Scaffold this active site. Structure first.
Site, PDB file in Angstrom:
ATOM      1  N   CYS A  69       0.713  -1.130  -0.110  1.00 56.84           N
ATOM      2  CA  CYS A  69       0.104   0.164  -0.105  1.00 56.84           C
ATOM      3  C   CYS A  69       0.768   1.210   0.028  1.00 56.84           C
ATOM      4  CB  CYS A  69      -0.903  -0.144   1.308  1.00 56.84           C
ATOM      5  SG  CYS A  69      -1.846   1.399   1.338  1.00 56.84           S
TER       6      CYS A  69
ATOM      7  N   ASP B 231       0.400   4.304   1.690  1.00 56.57           N
ATOM      8  CA  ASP B 231       0.643   4.986   2.966  1.00 56.57           C
ATOM      9  C   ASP B 231       1.183   4.076   3.855  1.00 56.57           C
ATOM     10  OD1 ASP B 231      -3.232   4.931   3.099  1.00 56.57           O
ATOM     11  OD2 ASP B 231      -1.701   3.673   4.265  1.00 56.57           O
TER      12      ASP B 231
ATOM     13  N   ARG C 244       3.656   2.818   6.242  1.00 54.88           N
ATOM     14  CA  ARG C 244       4.901   3.424   6.672  1.00 54.88           C
ATOM     15  C   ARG C 244       6.132   2.522   6.489  1.00 54.88           C
ATOM     16  NH1 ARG C 244       2.232   7.608   6.807  1.00 54.88           N
ATOM     17  NH2 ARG C 244       1.535   8.788   8.375  1.00 54.88           N
TER      18      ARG C 244
ATOM     19  N   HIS D  43      -2.158  -3.615   6.222  1.00 58.95           N
ATOM     20  CA  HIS D  43      -1.870  -3.193   7.295  1.00 58.95           C
ATOM     21  C   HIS D  43      -2.704  -2.474   8.032  1.00 58.95           C
ATOM     22  CE1 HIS D  43      -0.654   1.235   6.099  1.00 58.95           C
ATOM     23  NE2 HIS D  43      -1.253   0.627   5.077  1.00 58.95           N
TER      24      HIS D  43
ATOM     25  N   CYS E  60      -4.737   1.870   8.160  1.00 58.94           N
ATOM     26  CA  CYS E  60      -4.313   1.787   6.849  1.00 58.94           C
ATOM     27  C   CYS E  60      -5.382   3.226   6.309  1.00 58.94           C
ATOM     28  CB  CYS E  60      -4.694   0.614   5.796  1.00 58.94           C
ATOM     29  SG  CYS E  60      -4.525   1.107   4.164  1.00 58.94           S
TER      30      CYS E  60
END
Ligand SMILES: [Zn+2]
Ligand SMILES: [Zn+2]
Ligand SMILES: [Zn+2]
Ligand SMILES: [Zn+2]
Lengths: 182, 186, 182, 186
Positions: free
Chosen positions: A9, A11, A13, A65, A68
């Site tokens: 994904c 975004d 981290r 995650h 999200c």
């Protein structure tokens, strides 16, 4: 040459190279919003097709995650513009598993959807004509569906791991059966 | 919250996290083969719209790199399947700078073409409806073209950097002019 | 089973079946704005791929037309929204042939671009991995590039007709050389 | 000027021009395999945005048909290549109505599925950002789901017709309920 394709994904981290802890270049990496494998997305199909047929990669990992932002975006009932169309595919997933999510306290509901989302994307991946063809012609190829939780790095091979079309079916069903125990 | 979109290549051996040494959390990352922004690609365009319009990101960076499998795959005149269609846009660019690339020593072309690619992807990006509107309504959005090389581990801001349609024309054209200046070991 | 695939424009008044005057079902039809074949467009790639590999169609016709609203849209310097992104590909074509179009009286310039656009789309089509593969494996397949003018139905096989990769190259170059005589 | 977008199938033996007997000039036509509106398909979504926002069209019609090569290609569990990926969305819908389609005589399933497809494509269409905004800002836009059959040459407005998000929910759900009413020659 890399031996893994990581669909993640945008975004998230954590870089993949931290989480797989593979040395550098063992890894071939795509990242989209909410780590989708959409049937008709050229960008990502292309990545898979090149990985599988040309790089001869033997393991594909879809990784989602907790917390999200894109799953949040999807659930929000709001006019975000072009991206809303991208996030309809997640909304379909939500609808598909409505009884299940409907039963959950609202707060824990986005985390369920991240997990569910992963299993569905893995299934889509196993249903591409690239992956179908590979398995059909005897190529060795595993599909993996991970959700990781920012709350102490932890990663779980969400029910889904598939090495064949038969086992793709068993694994996804068991995965959903198991998300459904509360 | 993130303040940066990184559009980079699926080959890149190195995270943006490392490449910019921002704390991971600052970056919002798209990766595809040969770091492209294709005018009509829903995937990347969606990343871009979300970032600009919803996340409110003032900085987009497209980062190519030397020794790129995708660029070499683009130039390898081979029947690779689906992926060739994707790499046709890279050959469009190859073709578009064929005189420059022709006046040039073969083992250097892939890397020239990696650099040219970054210039063009940023041009494409500054011409998306998403970026033009942003700029038209006074938003602060800087687009950047970088290229990194592993041999020395360092970048260089490929003359491409735009904060306006105005400035996009100028850096794009400049990038191509600086690129066209050949130090004669071709 | 049809023996032709017709890629046409969405604002073209004339149905294909009038213009080819093929009986019904000889024809398999896609229509997009400004009759593009974009390298990475799944919708249209799919159509071509199915036509070529599964329907075993032997002739593909890209058809444009004078007074084309989408070519107009493309040339207009205006914020139309999502479609502008679709029409960038036509703007590239315009830029590519700028000296040529630059020389024309403004009024006749959109008609030139319709003709030029067709030749470029035909070329893209001949450069898809589907069409490349067909020619490479000896399949019989012709590519045709027509512009028709509302001003008395008239249709012209714009320089482009291709049956091989070699002849795709000769035909397109001659086509552009010939548009360039004023 | 056109007042209508027709989204129809690349197989359809018959023009919209004929199918609606509007003068050609009224219709603005998209055609693809199995008359789909896929959430993230740039091609069709662009047709739709242009029509709604620029051409200012108050009527969009999605028109499927019986005896459809695409629907049959979707259901043929075969290795057709690229096109299968496109037809996966059709199998998504097959799967989603598998109990209905299972309680049903085999040589009738393709046609049920043609009809179900139209219901769902219109749902998809009314959920595009393009159509939702239009409806939110008070524009007049009616979406229609039709199916035609050659045997008798006639249509029937597949219970699907929406002028609002409100009404889209109701006709979509209704379409599926009327479809689920089986006259027992399965
Ligand atoms: Zn995320
Ligand atoms: Zn690379
Ligand atoms: Zn037109
Ligand atoms: Zn059909």
């Amino acid at each position: 040459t890399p031996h893994y394709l990581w669909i993640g994904c945008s975004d998230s981290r954590a870089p993949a190279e931290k989480l797989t802890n593979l040395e550098p270049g063992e890894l071939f990496v795509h990242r989209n919003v909410a780590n989708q494998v959409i049937h008709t997305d050229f960008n990502c199909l292309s990545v898979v097709q090149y990985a599988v047929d040309v790089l001869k990669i033997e393991h594909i990992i879809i990784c989602g995650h907790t917390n999200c932002g894109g799953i949040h975006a999807a659930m929000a009932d709001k006019d975000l513009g072009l991206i809303n169309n991208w996030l309809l595919h997640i909304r379909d997933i939500w609808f598909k598993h409505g009884h299940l999510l409907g039963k959950l306290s609202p707060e824990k509901r986005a985390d369920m959807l991240t997990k569910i989302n992963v299993a569905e994307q893995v299934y889509n991946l196993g249903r591409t004509s690239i992956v179908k063809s590979a398995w059909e012609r005897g190529q060795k190829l595993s599909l993996h569906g991970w959700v990781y939780d920012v709350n102490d790095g932890f990663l779980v091979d969400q029910g889904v791991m598939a090495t064949s079309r038969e086992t793709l079916e068993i694994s996804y069903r068991n995965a959903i059966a198991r998300l459904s125990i509360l």
